[PDB]
Design a binder for this molecule. Structure first.
Ligand SMILES: [Cl-]
Ligand SMILES: [Cl-]
Ligand SMILES: [Cl-]
Ligand SMILES: [Cl-]
Ligand SMILES: [Mg+2]
Ligand SMILES: [Mg+2]
Length: 355
């Protein structure tokens, strides 16, 4: 139907909150590669044979033609990174989790946003192409920049190669499909159960957040018997997407759900919301070889980070596994880790993010 149009308008209101004029510029080739001092979120990732290829790509886009990988990434960043930097500066309340600092108050902010309409909460990821939602991503970028007919054509041409290209290309795009596809699901879930609500009632019953293809969705009890994992998964295949649950209940609680390979843990003693990383991920950070074979430059640092990551689980888990990781590294290398205590890591996070 013409619901893509109302999805797009609702989303725009949300995603455009907090606009800064200093960010509505296409970046120079140098800014695209080494960042700019306008944002903490525009940062730095032959020297003149590829600039000549970016040039060929930009001009060919200006006349409507697209070409066929590093030059694509720099171009895309030039025309889109200010927008992405805007989403990151207004993160979480704008439904976009790109830029979340899980060691900081962002995590409790994410929790405050996913408990806004009660206790029911779901999570999962989508998989496929739907060029009608993708199209509108170019549109919303263009609406953000307001910089002329030519730039708009370039954003539309670049977006057509994003999936075949990189990380900053598909990740905010899939965030957009999330915010869009789940307002659409809300509307098609109300027609199949004959509820006299419209997409403008989404923002009164649903709070959501996304990181690329992965989301967490909070919804009120009022809407929960017709808008939940079961119905939303079905609605989402009407749009061309499989929508699996990470790990089928109709809802859960914020403490049961996994997001960015982490969980929402409230620490009763230290009264704080923390982001324990899955042990299966933590435990692939060290090199366990007892002969210290492929010890790379970052092996020591990888071990230290794994142990820092243990400090956001309960203390029992940090006490068990930090000793295991510490002894393994010692026997393998004959060297030692510089690690902190449990409350030492907690204090590190307080001094840097709560103060
Ligand atoms: Cl299509
Ligand atoms: Cl775990
Ligand atoms: Cl987990
Ligand atoms: Cl071994
Ligand atoms: Mg993912
Ligand atoms: Mg593993």
């Amino acid at each position: 139907k013409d619901m893509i149009d109302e999805a797009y308008q609702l989303t725009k209101s949300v995603w455009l909150k907090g606009m800064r004029d200093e960010l509505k510029k296409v970046l120079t080739y140098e800014e695209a590669i080494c960042g700019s001092e306008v944002s903490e979120y525009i940062s730095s990732i032959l020297n003149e044979d590829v600039r000549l290829a970016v040039q060929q790509r930009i001009q060919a886009a200006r006349e409507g033609k697209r070409l066929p990988p590093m030059d694509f990434s720099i171009a895309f960043r030039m025309y889109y990174l200010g927008f992405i930097a805007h989403l990151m500066e207004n993160r979480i309340t704008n439904e976009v989790s790109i830029g979340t600092n899980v060691y900081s108050q962002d995590w409790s902010k994410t929790v405050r946003k996913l408990t806004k309409f009660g206790n029911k909460v779901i999570a999962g990821d989508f998989s496929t192409l739907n060029v009608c939602i993708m199209e509108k991503f170019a549109d919303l970028a263009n609406e953000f920049y307001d910089d002329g007919k030519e730039n708009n054509l370039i954003r539309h041409v670049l977006l057509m190669d994003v999936y075949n290209s990189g990380n900053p290309a598909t990740t905010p795009l899939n965030c957009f499909i999330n915010s869009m596809g789940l307002r659409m699901c809300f509307a098609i879930c109300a027609k199949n159960a004959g509820i006299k609500m419209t997409m403008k009632d989404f923002g009164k019953h649903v709070s959501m957040v996304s990181y690329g293809d992965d989301n967490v969705i909070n919804f009120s009890d009022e809407v929960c018997e017709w808008y939940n994992m079961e119905t939303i998964a079905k609605a989402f295949e009407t749009l061309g997407f499989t929508y699996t649950d990470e790990l089928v209940p109709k809802w859960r609680s914020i403490k049961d759900v996994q997001y960015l390979k982490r969980k929402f843990r409230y620490d009763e003693q230290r009264k704080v919301w923390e982001a324990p990383l899955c042990m299966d991920t933590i435990l692939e950070m060290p090199n366990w070889c007892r002969g210290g074979l492929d010890i790379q430059e970052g092996t020591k640092l990888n071990c230290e980070n794994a142990i820092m990551e243990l400090s956001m689980h309960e203390e029992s888990v940090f006490d068990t596994w930090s000793k295991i990781i510490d002894r393994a590294y010692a026997n393998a290398t004959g060297d030692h880790l510089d690690i902190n205590t449990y409350r030492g890591y907690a204090q590190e996070r307080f001094l840097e993010y709560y103060m």
